[PDB]
Amino acid sequence: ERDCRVSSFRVKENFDKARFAGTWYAMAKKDPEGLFLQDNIVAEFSVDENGHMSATAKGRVRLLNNWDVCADMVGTFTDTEDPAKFKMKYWGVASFLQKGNDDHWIIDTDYETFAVQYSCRLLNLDGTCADSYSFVFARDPSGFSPEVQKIVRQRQEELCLARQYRLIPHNGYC
Ligand SMILES: CC1=C(/C=C/C(C)=C/C=C/C(C)=C/C(=O)Nc2ccc(O)cc2)C(C)(C)CCC1
Numbered sequence: 164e165r166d167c168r169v170s171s172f173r174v175k176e177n178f179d180k181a182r183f184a185g186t187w188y189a190m191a192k193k194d195p196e197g198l199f200l201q202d203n204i205v206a207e208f209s210v211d212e213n214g215h216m217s218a219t220a221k222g223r224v225r226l227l228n229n230w231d232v233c234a235d236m237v238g239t240f241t242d243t244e245d246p247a248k249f250k251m252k253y254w255g256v257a258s259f260l261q262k263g264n265d266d267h268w269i270i271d272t273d274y275e276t277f278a279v280q281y282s283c284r285l286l287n288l289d290g291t292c293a294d295s296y297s298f299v300f301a302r303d304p305s306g307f308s309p310e311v312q313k314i315v316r317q318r319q320e321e322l323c324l325a326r327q328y329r330l331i332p333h334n335g336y337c
Pocket residue numbers: 198199200206218219220224225226227228234236237238253254259260261298
């Protein structure tokens with residue numbers, strides 16, 4: 164019954180970039196293929212006077228060589244015709260960090276407690292997603308009550324990613 168076509172996914176209605184600024188802690192995540200961010204991830208969103216949006220992220224990375232380091236990443240977002248879907252350019256302070264450009268959709272958020280984000284880096288010929296990433300973010304590193312949980316569990320199912328997220332740890336590494 165429920166479709167897994169990226170184009171049919173709902174996103175956050177009348178998304179407000181400014182109530183979205185501030186510190187977001189990653190509590191859970193579904194990784195994409197390849198190299199990614201491990202744990203201890205925290206993002207910081209800002210908006211300038213022109214209504215832009217940028218962000219900086221920190222997290223631990225395990226190099227393919229099993230190096231334990233802490234990435235400082237930067238991303239600039241470009242607006243689209245849908246206030247909740249952005250094109251994100253990103254890079255790291257250290258050149259060895261991945262550079263790239265990903266779709267950045269705001270699935271759901273209450274601006275005050277939680278956020279559900281998602282990116283599909285590759286579409287299968289059917290319109291479903293072949294390689295995706297999604298973050299569950301919290302304003303507070305102690306979490307969400309049981310009722311906010313229930314809402315996040317439902318959006319996850321809606322993105323056809325239910326059961327695929329792992330809890331992310333925060334231990335002060337970076
Ligand atoms: C900017 C940031 C976003 C996305 C960041 C991404 C998705 C970072 C990826 C970094 C990686 C994947 C580094 C890596 O490239 N890790 C390694 C591993 C091993 C190695 O040898 C080199 C690098 C997002 C959504 C959080 C919030 C908006 C700000």
